[PDB]
Write a protein that binds this ligand. Sequence first.
Ligand SMILES: *[C@H](O)[C@H](C[C@@H]1CCNC1=O)NC(=O)[C@@H]1[C@@H]2[C@H](CN1C(=O)OCc1ccccc1)C2(C)C
Ligand SMILES: *[C@H](O)[C@H](C[C@@H]1CCNC1=O)NC(=O)[C@@H]1[C@@H]2[C@H](CN1C(=O)OCc1ccccc1)C2(C)C
Ligand code: NA
Ligand code: NA
Lengths: 304, 304
Amino acid sequence: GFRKMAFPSGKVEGCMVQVTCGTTTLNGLWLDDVVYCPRHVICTSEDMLNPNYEDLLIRKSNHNFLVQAGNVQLRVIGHSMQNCVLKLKVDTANPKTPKYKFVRIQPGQTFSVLACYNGSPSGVYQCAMRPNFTIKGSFLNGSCGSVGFNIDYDCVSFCYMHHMELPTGVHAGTDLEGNFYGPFVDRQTAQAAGTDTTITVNVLAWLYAAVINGDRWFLNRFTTTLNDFNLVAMKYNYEPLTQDHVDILGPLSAQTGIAVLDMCASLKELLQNGMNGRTILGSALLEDEFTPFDVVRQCSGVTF
Amino acid sequence: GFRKMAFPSGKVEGCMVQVTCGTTTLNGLWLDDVVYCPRHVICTSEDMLNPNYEDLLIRKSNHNFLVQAGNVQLRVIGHSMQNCVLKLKVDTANPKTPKYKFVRIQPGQTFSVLACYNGSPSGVYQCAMRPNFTIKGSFLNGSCGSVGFNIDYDCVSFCYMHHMELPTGVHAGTDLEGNFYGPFVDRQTAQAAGTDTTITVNVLAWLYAAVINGDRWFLNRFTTTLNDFNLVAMKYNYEPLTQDHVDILGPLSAQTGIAVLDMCASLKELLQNGMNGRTILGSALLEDEFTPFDVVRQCSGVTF
Ligand SMILES: *[C@H](O)[C@H](C[C@@H]1CCNC1=O)NC(=O)[C@@H]1[C@@H]2[C@H](CN1C(=O)OCc1ccccc1)C2(C)C
Ligand SMILES: *[C@H](O)[C@H](C[C@@H]1CCNC1=O)NC(=O)[C@@H]1[C@@H]2[C@H](CN1C(=O)OCc1ccccc1)C2(C)C
Ligand code: NA
Ligand code: NA
């Protein structure tokens, strides 16, 4: 009774366009009269090693940029660089432009990715921004410019644009102002993500989902303190739990009649003892990709 | 590098409407001038125990059916019953009607569900039709009339409409002609799904995905026969593997240079020996919700 659910993708689908510069094709985001795409579209293979993007952009003409919106070729009348994103001003506003915001998300928060190739949607899935500011996505060559988003009421909040894959096979990208999440740079060099930690508040959310869905074996009759729990958290590379985390879990706490520090005590035992070959919500591992809001949305059936 | 991916849901989002009959509200599918919804919308609580649907439908007037398409109230000018579905003919054709087909899917095949409440999309996720003709969905009260679908090229293939939850917490529903998948009836009585089996051909697909994504520990230097494998399959409640299954896996076989009967031998060892606390594509259990086509689509990046 509990699934990894993406937001409906319709409002974003109408914004996806193709952006080609020589042999290099990727996706763009067409909002009002502006197409946002990764700046590495202006790069040839050789200059991806240490590109001088300012110098490369100067060499570019509007006409070097082939922007298609399905069958339509869309006429670029201008180009500018904001951090690691290119803004291609176009002669036509997107008539399918939804109501939108650009937001910078926090590590631990979730969003939907609309994976595109050649400006066409392939698929939609839910992602978490890892504590080390990577995402564990499914992106191939051509996936760049694919976007991550949340929907609140009738408003699309864009939070991610895809730029690259790291050696570990995880993914990195920017906010829609072109500021990388984490320490990453848009050039083809070996780059280390931090050690990643498990998103403790999300694991608690998901244990609450497990209880709501009648799956309770792991509950014990013990409590604990933020202090003592955080000692075990540190030992298993779990993020420390703050009183903010405890306050955000209050609704799930109240719904289930299980105090947050009581759930923490249950999590302690799972980390120390493993799951003994048992499953929780049909998983053999502790899941950390569901925020407290994701759990509440899916158990209370919120719409858009 | 491998995720449970849903189809983009835009084309389906434009078809979802609200259908209310007394205190009973659920979702409808508005295609051309017809709204398709579960027939149990005409039911009061008491008559859900053993409804005479023919007699109940006779008592109904067009005006008993409140059909809203967002802010629009849509005027029902007719009602008919096809098996377990109600066709509410309306005065306006859906101007957002996509190109579509109604298809009856086979056990083992996957589809995207667009979970709706009050005619508004909440979320999208990928499902498999279990061998026992159930789905393991996330559906609350009000979710009925939510639809399952595939997209081929520019065509939406509707294959599922949601009707009910079984005692086990799994879900049952119909094709869009109102024929239940499996032995289920739309009345509030205890109903047994069969014993469910694991979709062997999908587990093989997913092991191929694991190899393509560099995750290979489980490969062994052994082969086997359909005959000998099916003896182990039967013992672990896996579906028997047919030469059709072997032919469908040919592309993944050819891509990886691993013969289907060689992968089967690897699966044999996993079933007999467990995973020794190892993970495959970040899972501690064998996944059976990915068809060979799903794997090929996601590793080759097919679009719509
Ligand atoms: C944009 O489509 C593309 C997406 C990558 C390619 C494979 N999976 C992805 O997520 N981004 C890039 O190609 C960037 C780009 C150059 C290299 N880079 C990158 O991801 O390097 C790793 C890579 C490349 C190709 C195949 C596998 C791995 C710069 C400018 C950062
Ligand atoms: C239609 O919205 C609704 C969806 C169920 C309710 C909870 N989760 C679901 O998938 N379908 C029904 O209510 C049908 C209907 C009557 C009963 N039934 C049903 O699912 O019974 C089980 C149930 C009901 C409510 C809450 C939990 C479980 C008939 C006519 C088959
Ligand atoms: Na131009
Ligand atoms: Na009417």
